[PDB]
């Protein structure tokens, strides 16, 4: 599950890039990861 936002720009639209914060995992199997990444709209769906 990805929590994403319309990318940062000043209006004049009508996005497609998302600031996506999601809970992920690390090399250590117990502890986990909280990271953000920017994705094109075609690789995801709500």
């Amino acid at each position, epitope marked *: 599950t990805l929590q994403c936002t319309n990318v940062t720009n000043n209006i004049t639209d009508d996005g497609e890039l998302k600031n996506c914060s999601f*809970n992920m995992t*690390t090399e250590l199997r*117990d*502890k*986990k*990861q*909280k*990271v953000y990444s920017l994705f094109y709209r075609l690789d995801v769906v709500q």
Partner: antibody
Amino acid sequence: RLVESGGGVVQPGSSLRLSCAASGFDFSRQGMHWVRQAPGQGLEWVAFIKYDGSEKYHADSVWGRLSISRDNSKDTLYLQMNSLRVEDTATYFCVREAGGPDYRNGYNYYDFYDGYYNYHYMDVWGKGTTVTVSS
Amino acid sequence: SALTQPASVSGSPGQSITISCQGTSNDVGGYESVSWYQQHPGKAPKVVIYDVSKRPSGVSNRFSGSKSGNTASLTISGLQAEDEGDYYCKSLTSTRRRVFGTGTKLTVLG
């Protein structure tokens, strides 16, 4: 271990900077308070800061006179006390209240790369640095 | 604006007593974050209650907490001399600031 420092006996109209130097935990991902207490009085709350330092909430008794700031790298909180008056005669504590260590589904979720969260309270509370504004 | 507490309580040893903290719906009545602090002379406060019902590890079972409406209460059963001190409640507010009670001076009676 918190080192609440920076206080002193000053004048009304002066200015001062406090320091809550933090050890024993990761200050860089933990939101803190300043908390003052006039001698023999209740805990007059001062100011909250975010775990990195963008949010700077304040009580309006201190705002924007006693401005909270921090350095995540130094592991040290600060209270930029500007335009001092007699109500700043107080004992300035250092308090953590927000947050939870995100132990969910039986596993420690953490935010950015296994930091420490706020823990709903403190492992060790504020000692209180004393600003004493007399005339 | 401070959360309102009774200036003082008092009790004979063994007596149970109660302290009230009355806020608004934007702090005490709006959240479960009410916590309670005990303070001795010349010392820094220690939290005896959090999330309004909860005791931090190491605290006596004589300390309980509760909330009804905009008024949260700390209750001490079986007062012992060492309970004497000042008691402050802290609450979280809608703007995510913190606010303290006006304080209560509790006297276990010699």
